[PDB]
Amino acid sequence: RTAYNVAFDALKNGKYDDASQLFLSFLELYPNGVYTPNALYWLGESYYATRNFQLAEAQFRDLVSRYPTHDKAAGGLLKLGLSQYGEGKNTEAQQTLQQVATQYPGSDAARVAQERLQSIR
Ligand SMILES: [Zn+2]
Numbered sequence: 001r002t003a004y005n006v007a008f009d010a011l012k013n014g015k016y017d018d019a020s021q022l023f024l025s026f027l028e029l030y031p032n033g034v035y036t037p038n039a040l041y042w043l044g045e046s047y048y049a050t051r052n053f054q055l056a057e058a059q060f061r062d063l064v065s066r067y068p069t070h071d072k073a074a075g076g077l078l079k080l081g082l083s084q085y086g087e088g089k090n091t092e093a094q095q096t097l098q099q100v101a102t103q104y105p106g107s108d109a110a111r112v113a114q115e116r117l118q119s120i121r
Contacts (some may be wrong), residue, residue, distance in 0.1 A: 004035045020046040020055075036062055041072040044079055053086035056064035074100060080111065085120065094120060095102055 007022035023043035030036050044059035060080035064073050081096030097120070100113035 003029065004039065007039070007043065016046045016049045018051075019035055019043075020052075026058055037067040037070040037072050040067075041079075044076065044083075047085075048079060048083060051086065053083045057087065061113040066105075074104035074107040077104065078109040078113045078116075085116075086091065090120065 003022070003026050007019060010016075010022055011019035012090065013075065020043060023039050023046060026039045027036065040059045040063035041105050044056045044063065047053070047056035047059065057080060060076045060083060063070070064080060065078040067073055070076075077100045079098065081093050081100065084096055085093035087093075094117060097113040097117040100107070101110045106111050
Protein backbone atom coordinates (compact mmCIF):
# COMPACT_ATOMS: atom_id res chain seq x y z
CA ARG A 1 0.00 0.00 0.00
CA THR A 2 1.52 3.35 -1.19
CA ALA A 3 0.54 6.99 -2.12
CA TYR A 4 -1.25 5.86 -5.27
CA ASN A 5 -3.54 3.60 -3.20
CA VAL A 6 -4.36 6.34 -0.71
CA ALA A 7 -5.41 8.62 -3.58
CA PHE A 8 -7.35 5.87 -5.38
CA ASP A 9 -9.27 5.00 -2.21
CA ALA A 10 -10.47 8.58 -1.78
CA LEU A 11 -11.73 8.43 -5.39
CA LYS A 12 -13.41 5.02 -4.81
CA ASN A 13 -15.28 6.55 -1.88
CA GLY A 14 -16.50 9.50 -3.94
CA LYS A 15 -14.41 12.05 -2.02
CA TYR A 16 -13.44 13.91 -5.16
CA ASP A 17 -11.92 16.98 -3.52
CA ASP A 18 -9.64 14.79 -1.38
CA ALA A 19 -8.89 12.59 -4.39
CA SER A 20 -7.85 15.57 -6.50
CA GLN A 21 -5.48 16.82 -3.75
CA LEU A 22 -3.98 13.35 -3.34
CA PHE A 23 -3.51 12.62 -7.06
CA LEU A 24 -2.11 16.16 -7.56
CA SER A 25 0.34 15.41 -4.75
CA PHE A 26 1.18 12.01 -6.27
CA LEU A 27 2.04 13.70 -9.57
CA GLU A 28 4.40 16.15 -7.85
CA LEU A 29 6.38 13.16 -6.61
CA TYR A 30 6.03 11.03 -9.75
CA PRO A 31 6.27 13.16 -12.89
CA ASN A 32 7.28 10.00 -14.83
CA GLY A 33 6.67 6.90 -12.70
CA VAL A 34 4.92 3.62 -13.41
CA TYR A 35 1.56 4.93 -12.18
CA THR A 36 1.85 8.44 -13.60
CA PRO A 37 -0.51 7.74 -16.55
CA ASN A 38 -3.08 6.21 -14.15
CA ALA A 39 -2.80 9.20 -11.81
CA LEU A 40 -3.26 11.71 -14.66
CA TYR A 41 -6.36 9.75 -15.73
CA TRP A 42 -7.89 9.55 -12.26
CA LEU A 43 -7.04 13.17 -11.45
CA GLY A 44 -8.82 14.06 -14.68
CA GLU A 45 -11.80 11.95 -13.62
CA SER A 46 -11.89 13.54 -10.15
CA TYR A 47 -12.05 17.00 -11.77
CA TYR A 48 -14.58 15.85 -14.39
CA ALA A 49 -16.82 14.48 -11.56
CA THR A 50 -17.06 17.97 -10.04
CA ARG A 51 -17.50 19.75 -13.41
CA ASN A 52 -14.04 21.30 -13.17
CA PHE A 53 -13.58 20.98 -16.93
CA GLN A 54 -10.55 23.27 -17.30
CA LEU A 55 -8.70 21.36 -14.63
CA ALA A 56 -9.77 18.03 -16.19
CA GLU A 57 -8.71 19.13 -19.67
CA ALA A 58 -5.11 19.71 -18.56
CA GLN A 59 -4.78 16.22 -17.08
CA PHE A 60 -6.38 14.28 -19.94
CA ARG A 61 -4.44 16.24 -22.58
CA ASP A 62 -1.14 15.52 -20.81
CA LEU A 63 -1.99 11.82 -20.46
CA VAL A 64 -2.74 11.38 -24.16
CA SER A 65 0.24 13.49 -25.27
CA ARG A 66 2.83 11.68 -23.18
CA TYR A 67 1.36 8.18 -22.97
CA PRO A 68 -0.52 7.64 -26.28
CA THR A 69 -0.16 3.82 -26.14
CA HIS A 70 -1.11 3.43 -22.48
CA ASP A 71 -4.24 1.45 -21.53
CA LYS A 72 -5.84 4.68 -20.29
CA ALA A 73 -5.08 6.81 -23.38
CA ALA A 74 -8.22 6.06 -25.45
CA GLY A 75 -10.51 6.80 -22.49
CA GLY A 76 -8.34 9.83 -21.74
CA LEU A 77 -8.89 11.28 -25.22
CA LEU A 78 -12.64 10.60 -24.91
CA LYS A 79 -12.71 12.46 -21.58
CA LEU A 80 -10.59 15.27 -23.03
CA GLY A 81 -13.30 15.81 -25.66
CA LEU A 82 -16.08 15.58 -23.07
CA SER A 83 -14.21 18.12 -20.91
CA GLN A 84 -13.93 20.49 -23.89
CA TYR A 85 -17.68 20.12 -24.45
CA GLY A 86 -18.09 21.02 -20.75
CA GLU A 87 -16.03 24.18 -21.37
CA GLY A 88 -18.50 25.13 -24.10
CA LYS A 89 -15.88 24.58 -26.80
CA ASN A 90 -18.07 22.61 -29.21
CA THR A 91 -15.83 22.79 -32.30
CA GLU A 92 -12.75 21.58 -30.39
CA ALA A 93 -14.80 18.88 -28.55
CA GLN A 94 -16.16 17.42 -31.83
CA GLN A 95 -12.62 17.39 -33.27
CA THR A 96 -11.33 15.51 -30.19
CA LEU A 97 -14.16 12.96 -30.15
CA GLN A 98 -13.53 12.32 -33.85
CA GLN A 99 -9.86 11.79 -32.98
CA VAL A 100 -10.78 8.87 -30.65
CA ALA A 101 -12.22 6.80 -33.53
CA THR A 102 -9.24 7.69 -35.76
CA GLN A 103 -6.44 7.01 -33.26
CA TYR A 104 -8.09 4.30 -31.17
CA PRO A 105 -10.28 2.37 -33.64
CA GLY A 106 -12.22 -0.51 -32.05
CA SER A 107 -11.65 0.66 -28.46
CA ASP A 108 -14.54 0.97 -26.00
CA ALA A 109 -13.66 4.68 -25.84
CA ALA A 110 -14.09 5.11 -29.61
CA ARG A 111 -17.58 3.58 -29.40
CA VAL A 112 -18.59 5.95 -26.60
CA ALA A 113 -17.03 8.91 -28.43
CA GLN A 114 -19.18 8.14 -31.48
CA GLU A 115 -22.32 7.90 -29.31
CA ARG A 116 -21.56 11.24 -27.65
CA LEU A 117 -20.60 12.83 -30.97
CA GLN A 118 -23.95 11.88 -32.52
CA SER A 119 -25.73 13.37 -29.46
CA ILE A 120 -23.74 16.61 -29.83
CA ARG A 121 -24.61 16.19 -33.55
ZN1 LIG B 1 -10.40 23.64 -23.88
